[PDB]
Amino acid sequence: ISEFARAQLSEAMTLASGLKTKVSDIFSQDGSCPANTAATAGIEKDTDINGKYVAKVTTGGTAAASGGCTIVATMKASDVATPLRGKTLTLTLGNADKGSYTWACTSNADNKYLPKTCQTATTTTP
Amino acid sequence: ISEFARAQLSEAMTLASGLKTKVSDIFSQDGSCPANTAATAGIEKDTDINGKYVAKVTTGGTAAASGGCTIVATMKASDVATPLRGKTLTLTLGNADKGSYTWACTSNADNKYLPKTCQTATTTT
């Protein structure tokens, strides 16, 4: 299991996490979710938010009383571990109508490469 | 003002008014004013009482002989006329010691966006 692959996803988490306050501020001020396909007040264009392994970081999502805004990092399509190429890592705002805002992490990459708090759970059924 | 601004404030009035019976029933049965920061018996959570233009409707206030319970509608922070964004419209219970419940309307919006019954009065001194 590649620890190099794990670190690449860690970069995506860090870059996505860097937008949490800016996105939460807009949600709390305006009750809306900012979208940065182009630069928008206070947030750079998604493709201008990048790293060594991350192509873009896109804010979006659908607003609900509980939150709903998303920050999605998309991995580069080369010079990245093959199972991560083009994959995404998503932070989603929640809890906004109950208590302190939360940011849940999910991803379409395999759990083996993800931080524990970003992994899905698989169970048997009856 | 515009028909749209009127419709927006009117939604607040309508949503707040939909809680009058429930609030007044609790004041009369329990003796205290219900608070719906969380859902409470008879009343939804404030943020679950919403509309096209209205973000939440909160019951509260301090009991007095004549009532005193409040129903406060908060306007959304977007998709509403700019001067109404985030403003509140308050209905306050009165006359409870005398007869039929009355509900006086106040607001923290500019008077020009409010119907006469909800407006403040300014005079020289």
mmCIF file of C-alpha atoms in Angstrom:
data_model
loop_
_atom_site.group_PDB
_atom_site.id
_atom_site.type_symbol
_atom_site.label_atom_id
_atom_site.label_comp_id
_atom_site.label_asym_id
_atom_site.label_seq_id
_atom_site.Cartn_x
_atom_site.Cartn_y
_atom_site.Cartn_z
ATOM 1 C CA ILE A 1 0.000 0.000 0.000
ATOM 2 C CA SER A 2 1.686 3.132 -1.249
ATOM 3 C CA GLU A 3 2.474 5.666 1.446
ATOM 4 C CA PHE A 4 3.427 7.953 -1.418
ATOM 5 C CA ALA A 5 -0.163 7.681 -2.689
ATOM 6 C CA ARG A 6 -1.415 8.380 0.825
ATOM 7 C CA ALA A 7 0.650 11.584 0.987
ATOM 8 C CA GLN A 8 -0.699 12.791 -2.346
ATOM 9 C CA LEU A 9 -4.252 12.575 -1.008
ATOM 10 C CA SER A 10 -3.056 14.266 2.126
ATOM 11 C CA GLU A 11 -2.078 17.255 -0.059
ATOM 12 C CA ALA A 12 -5.641 17.334 -1.420
ATOM 13 C CA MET A 13 -7.051 17.349 2.110
ATOM 14 C CA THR A 14 -4.782 20.211 3.130
ATOM 15 C CA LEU A 15 -5.671 22.361 0.103
ATOM 16 C CA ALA A 16 -9.398 21.669 0.465
ATOM 17 C CA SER A 17 -9.199 22.386 4.205
ATOM 18 C CA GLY A 18 -7.683 25.803 3.437
ATOM 19 C CA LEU A 19 -11.076 26.961 2.093
ATOM 20 C CA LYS A 20 -13.238 25.887 5.056
ATOM 21 C CA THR A 21 -13.320 29.266 6.732
ATOM 22 C CA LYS A 22 -13.936 31.269 3.573
ATOM 23 C CA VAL A 23 -16.797 28.984 2.509
ATOM 24 C CA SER A 24 -18.302 28.814 6.047
ATOM 25 C CA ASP A 25 -18.188 32.651 6.204
ATOM 26 C CA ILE A 26 -20.171 32.999 2.996
ATOM 27 C CA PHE A 27 -22.717 30.391 4.161
ATOM 28 C CA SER A 28 -23.178 32.176 7.483
ATOM 29 C CA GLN A 29 -23.297 35.703 5.883
ATOM 30 C CA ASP A 30 -25.444 34.970 2.846
ATOM 31 C CA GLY A 31 -27.070 31.554 3.409
ATOM 32 C CA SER A 32 -25.627 30.482 0.055
ATOM 33 C CA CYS A 33 -22.794 28.276 -1.247
ATOM 34 C CA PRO A 34 -20.064 30.004 -3.273
ATOM 35 C CA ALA A 35 -19.130 28.552 -6.674
ATOM 36 C CA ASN A 36 -15.622 29.243 -8.020
ATOM 37 C CA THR A 37 -15.683 27.932 -11.595
ATOM 38 C CA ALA A 38 -14.562 31.506 -12.094
ATOM 39 C CA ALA A 39 -13.014 33.601 -9.327
ATOM 40 C CA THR A 40 -15.686 34.896 -7.006
ATOM 41 C CA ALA A 41 -15.545 37.316 -4.083
ATOM 42 C CA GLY A 42 -12.820 36.070 -1.784
ATOM 43 C CA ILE A 43 -12.096 32.731 -3.513
ATOM 44 C CA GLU A 44 -9.837 32.089 -6.477
ATOM 45 C CA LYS A 45 -10.837 30.227 -9.610
ATOM 46 C CA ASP A 46 -10.764 26.486 -8.947
ATOM 47 C CA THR A 47 -7.909 25.758 -11.371
ATOM 48 C CA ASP A 48 -5.880 28.505 -9.665
ATOM 49 C CA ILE A 49 -6.133 26.495 -6.394
ATOM 50 C CA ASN A 50 -3.671 23.712 -7.069
ATOM 51 C CA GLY A 51 -0.666 21.811 -5.789
ATOM 52 C CA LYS A 52 1.922 19.297 -6.812
ATOM 53 C CA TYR A 53 -0.727 16.543 -7.081
ATOM 54 C CA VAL A 54 -3.986 18.535 -7.116
ATOM 55 C CA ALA A 55 -5.363 20.052 -10.317
ATOM 56 C CA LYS A 56 -8.137 22.227 -8.884
ATOM 57 C CA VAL A 57 -10.239 22.863 -5.795
ATOM 58 C CA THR A 58 -13.887 23.617 -6.550
ATOM 59 C CA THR A 59 -16.406 25.108 -4.145
ATOM 60 C CA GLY A 60 -20.065 24.336 -4.740
ATOM 61 C CA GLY A 61 -22.824 22.245 -3.276
ATOM 62 C CA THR A 62 -26.452 22.831 -2.548
ATOM 63 C CA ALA A 63 -27.405 24.987 0.443
ATOM 64 C CA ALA A 64 -29.607 23.501 3.163
ATOM 65 C CA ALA A 65 -30.460 24.721 6.708
ATOM 66 C CA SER A 66 -27.786 22.237 7.870
ATOM 67 C CA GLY A 67 -25.078 23.467 5.479
ATOM 68 C CA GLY A 68 -24.404 21.542 2.297
ATOM 69 C CA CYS A 69 -21.573 23.488 0.715
ATOM 70 C CA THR A 70 -18.795 21.399 -0.697
ATOM 71 C CA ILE A 71 -15.110 21.851 -1.339
ATOM 72 C CA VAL A 72 -13.875 19.287 -3.867
ATOM 73 C CA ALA A 73 -10.216 18.688 -4.675
ATOM 74 C CA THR A 74 -9.556 16.967 -8.000
ATOM 75 C CA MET A 75 -6.260 15.108 -8.460
ATOM 76 C CA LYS A 76 -4.082 15.611 -11.508
ATOM 77 C CA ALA A 77 -4.326 13.104 -14.335
ATOM 78 C CA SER A 78 -0.564 12.367 -14.433
ATOM 79 C CA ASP A 79 2.483 12.696 -12.143
ATOM 80 C CA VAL A 80 0.219 11.231 -9.443
ATOM 81 C CA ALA A 81 -0.110 7.599 -8.306
ATOM 82 C CA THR A 82 -2.170 5.768 -10.904
ATOM 83 C CA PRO A 83 -5.159 4.817 -8.676
ATOM 84 C CA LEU A 84 -5.518 8.465 -7.660
ATOM 85 C CA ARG A 85 -5.467 10.030 -11.108
ATOM 86 C CA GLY A 86 -8.538 12.252 -11.587
ATOM 87 C CA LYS A 87 -10.025 11.176 -8.231
ATOM 88 C CA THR A 88 -11.746 13.588 -5.878
ATOM 89 C CA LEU A 89 -11.775 14.349 -2.185
ATOM 90 C CA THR A 90 -14.814 16.268 -0.843
ATOM 91 C CA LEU A 91 -15.373 18.285 2.346
ATOM 92 C CA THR A 92 -19.056 18.954 3.084
ATOM 93 C CA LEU A 93 -20.413 21.501 5.551
ATOM 94 C CA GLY A 94 -22.892 20.114 8.072
ATOM 95 C CA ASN A 95 -24.485 20.660 11.471
ATOM 96 C CA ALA A 96 -25.239 24.329 10.705
ATOM 97 C CA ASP A 97 -28.747 24.234 12.209
ATOM 98 C CA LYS A 98 -27.793 22.190 15.298
ATOM 99 C CA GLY A 99 -24.411 23.357 16.640
ATOM 100 C CA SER A 100 -20.825 24.050 15.621
ATOM 101 C CA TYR A 101 -20.270 23.666 11.901
ATOM 102 C CA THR A 102 -18.689 20.380 10.818
ATOM 103 C CA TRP A 103 -16.833 19.351 7.670
ATOM 104 C CA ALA A 104 -17.209 15.686 6.767
ATOM 105 C CA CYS A 105 -14.694 14.186 4.394
ATOM 106 C CA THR A 106 -15.539 11.772 1.599
ATOM 107 C CA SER A 107 -13.700 10.629 -1.510
ATOM 108 C CA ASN A 108 -14.074 8.534 -4.611
ATOM 109 C CA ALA A 109 -10.557 7.099 -4.128
ATOM 110 C CA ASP A 110 -10.016 3.720 -2.516
ATOM 111 C CA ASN A 111 -10.197 3.690 1.279
ATOM 112 C CA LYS A 112 -6.675 2.249 1.489
ATOM 113 C CA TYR A 113 -5.252 5.638 0.453
ATOM 114 C CA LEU A 114 -7.470 7.827 2.610
ATOM 115 C CA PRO A 115 -7.218 9.271 6.082
ATOM 116 C CA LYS A 116 -9.350 7.295 8.577
ATOM 117 C CA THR A 117 -11.927 10.118 8.868
ATOM 118 C CA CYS A 118 -12.460 10.072 5.070
ATOM 119 C CA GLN A 119 -13.161 6.358 4.591
ATOM 120 C CA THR A 120 -16.458 4.676 3.800
ATOM 121 C CA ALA A 121 -17.876 1.722 5.747
ATOM 122 C CA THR A 122 -18.814 -1.595 4.113
ATOM 123 C CA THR A 123 -20.991 -4.179 5.906
ATOM 124 C CA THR A 124 -22.689 -7.500 5.126
ATOM 125 C CA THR A 125 -26.484 -7.622 4.691
ATOM 126 C CA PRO A 126 -29.237 -10.119 5.645
ATOM 127 C CA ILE B 1 -42.091 49.913 -2.563
ATOM 128 C CA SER B 2 -42.277 46.958 -4.948
ATOM 129 C CA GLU B 3 -44.868 44.162 -5.064
ATOM 130 C CA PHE B 4 -41.954 41.794 -4.508
ATOM 131 C CA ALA B 5 -40.864 43.460 -1.306
ATOM 132 C CA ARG B 6 -44.492 43.381 -0.179
ATOM 133 C CA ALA B 7 -44.725 39.650 -0.910
ATOM 134 C CA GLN B 8 -41.537 38.950 0.995
ATOM 135 C CA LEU B 9 -42.578 40.777 4.180
ATOM 136 C CA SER B 10 -46.076 39.276 3.802
ATOM 137 C CA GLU B 11 -44.585 35.742 3.942
ATOM 138 C CA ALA B 12 -42.935 36.613 7.212
ATOM 139 C CA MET B 13 -46.286 37.871 8.567
ATOM 140 C CA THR B 14 -48.026 34.722 7.357
ATOM 141 C CA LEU B 15 -45.499 32.300 8.836
ATOM 142 C CA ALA B 16 -45.400 34.151 12.143
ATOM 143 C CA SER B 17 -49.194 34.302 12.251
ATOM 144 C CA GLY B 18 -49.384 30.515 11.787
ATOM 145 C CA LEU B 19 -47.968 30.121 15.303
ATOM 146 C CA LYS B 20 -50.351 32.503 17.134
ATOM 147 C CA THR B 21 -52.814 29.820 18.260
ATOM 148 C CA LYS B 22 -50.105 27.378 19.342
ATOM 149 C CA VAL B 23 -48.141 29.970 21.294
ATOM 150 C CA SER B 24 -51.168 31.504 22.969
ATOM 151 C CA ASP B 25 -52.460 28.003 23.860
ATOM 152 C CA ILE B 26 -49.209 27.183 25.657
ATOM 153 C CA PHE B 27 -49.112 30.541 27.475
ATOM 154 C CA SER B 28 -52.639 29.862 28.688
ATOM 155 C CA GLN B 29 -52.131 26.163 29.528
ATOM 156 C CA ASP B 30 -48.536 26.168 30.858
ATOM 157 C CA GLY B 31 -48.300 29.805 32.011
ATOM 158 C CA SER B 32 -44.928 30.391 30.272
ATOM 159 C CA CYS B 33 -43.799 31.273 26.755
ATOM 160 C CA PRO B 34 -42.598 28.370 24.567
ATOM 161 C CA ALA B 35 -39.146 28.548 23.009
ATOM 162 C CA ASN B 36 -38.457 26.583 19.841
ATOM 163 C CA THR B 37 -34.640 26.704 19.524
ATOM 164 C CA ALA B 38 -35.229 22.992 19.372
ATOM 165 C CA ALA B 39 -38.608 21.567 18.431
ATOM 166 C CA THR B 40 -40.915 21.720 21.491
ATOM 167 C CA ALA B 41 -44.322 20.157 22.147
ATOM 168 C CA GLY B 42 -46.710 21.703 19.639
ATOM 169 C CA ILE B 43 -44.085 23.743 17.707
ATOM 170 C CA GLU B 44 -41.381 22.933 15.129
ATOM 171 C CA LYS B 45 -37.732 23.929 15.438
ATOM 172 C CA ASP B 46 -37.318 27.531 14.391
ATOM 173 C CA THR B 47 -35.145 26.758 11.377
ATOM 174 C CA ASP B 48 -37.726 24.222 10.153
ATOM 175 C CA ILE B 49 -40.346 26.993 9.937
ATOM 176 C CA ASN B 50 -39.270 28.654 6.721
ATOM 177 C CA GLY B 51 -40.406 29.732 3.294
ATOM 178 C CA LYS B 52 -39.282 31.245 0.005
ATOM 179 C CA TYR B 53 -38.182 34.449 1.774
ATOM 180 C CA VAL B 54 -38.028 33.478 5.458
ATOM 181 C CA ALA B 55 -35.181 31.585 7.145
ATOM 182 C CA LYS B 56 -36.666 30.821 10.555
ATOM 183 C CA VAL B 57 -39.485 31.646 12.931
ATOM 184 C CA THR B 58 -38.579 31.716 16.608
ATOM 185 C CA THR B 59 -40.958 31.693 19.574
ATOM 186 C CA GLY B 60 -39.778 33.209 22.808
ATOM 187 C CA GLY B 61 -40.350 36.205 24.998
ATOM 188 C CA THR B 62 -40.975 36.796 28.647
ATOM 189 C CA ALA B 63 -44.326 36.064 30.236
ATOM 190 C CA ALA B 64 -46.274 38.898 31.785
ATOM 191 C CA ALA B 65 -49.882 39.151 33.001
ATOM 192 C CA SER B 66 -51.098 40.232 29.568
ATOM 193 C CA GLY B 67 -49.009 37.802 27.532
ATOM 194 C CA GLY B 68 -45.603 38.853 26.272
ATOM 195 C CA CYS B 69 -44.720 35.841 24.185
ATOM 196 C CA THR B 70 -43.057 36.679 20.895
ATOM 197 C CA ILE B 71 -42.980 35.133 17.441
ATOM 198 C CA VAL B 72 -40.038 36.459 15.459
ATOM 199 C CA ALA B 73 -39.615 35.756 11.739
ATOM 200 C CA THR B 74 -36.121 36.257 10.321
ATOM 201 C CA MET B 75 -35.809 37.056 6.622
ATOM 202 C CA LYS B 76 -33.332 35.153 4.507
ATOM 203 C CA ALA B 77 -29.928 36.771 3.891
ATOM 204 C CA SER B 78 -30.228 36.382 0.142
ATOM 205 C CA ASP B 79 -32.953 36.216 -2.511
ATOM 206 C CA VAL B 80 -34.904 38.975 -0.737
ATOM 207 C CA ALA B 81 -34.832 42.795 -1.357
ATOM 208 C CA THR B 82 -31.569 44.134 0.048
ATOM 209 C CA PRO B 83 -33.055 46.252 2.903
ATOM 210 C CA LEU B 84 -35.078 43.235 4.101
ATOM 211 C CA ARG B 85 -32.173 40.763 4.158
ATOM 212 C CA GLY B 86 -31.738 39.304 7.643
ATOM 213 C CA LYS B 87 -34.336 41.654 9.159
ATOM 214 C CA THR B 88 -36.968 40.491 11.628
ATOM 215 C CA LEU B 89 -40.706 40.893 12.064
ATOM 216 C CA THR B 90 -41.998 40.341 15.597
ATOM 217 C CA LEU B 91 -45.558 39.568 16.787
ATOM 218 C CA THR B 92 -46.079 39.999 20.537
ATOM 219 C CA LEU B 93 -48.945 38.540 22.558
ATOM 220 C CA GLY B 94 -51.160 41.010 24.449
ATOM 221 C CA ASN B 95 -54.593 41.467 26.087
ATOM 222 C CA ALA B 96 -54.450 37.967 27.570
ATOM 223 C CA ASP B 97 -55.738 39.191 30.940
ATOM 224 C CA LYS B 98 -58.720 41.014 29.371
ATOM 225 C CA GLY B 99 -60.250 39.247 26.418
ATOM 226 C CA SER B 100 -59.295 37.907 23.049
ATOM 227 C CA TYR B 101 -55.576 37.680 22.420
ATOM 228 C CA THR B 102 -54.060 40.547 20.460
ATOM 229 C CA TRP B 103 -50.816 40.425 18.532
ATOM 230 C CA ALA B 104 -48.919 43.660 17.985
ATOM 231 C CA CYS B 105 -46.493 43.815 15.075
ATOM 232 C CA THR B 106 -43.024 45.410 15.207
ATOM 233 C CA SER B 107 -39.952 45.016 13.009
ATOM 234 C CA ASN B 108 -36.329 46.072 12.759
ATOM 235 C CA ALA B 109 -36.654 46.828 9.034
ATOM 236 C CA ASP B 110 -36.965 50.363 7.602
ATOM 237 C CA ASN B 111 -40.579 51.550 7.948
ATOM 238 C CA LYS B 112 -40.896 52.139 4.252
ATOM 239 C CA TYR B 113 -40.935 48.300 3.756
ATOM 240 C CA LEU B 114 -43.563 47.690 6.403
ATOM 241 C CA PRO B 115 -47.326 47.875 6.435
ATOM 242 C CA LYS B 116 -48.717 50.619 8.659
ATOM 243 C CA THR B 117 -49.619 48.290 11.559
ATOM 244 C CA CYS B 118 -45.944 47.218 11.853
ATOM 245 C CA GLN B 119 -44.417 50.712 11.487
ATOM 246 C CA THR B 120 -42.954 52.852 14.244
ATOM 247 C CA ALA B 121 -44.112 56.426 14.822
ATOM 248 C CA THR B 122 -41.772 59.428 14.860
ATOM 249 C CA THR B 123 -42.652 62.802 16.314
ATOM 250 C CA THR B 124 -41.126 66.130 17.272
ATOM 251 C CA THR B 125 -40.562 67.036 20.910
#
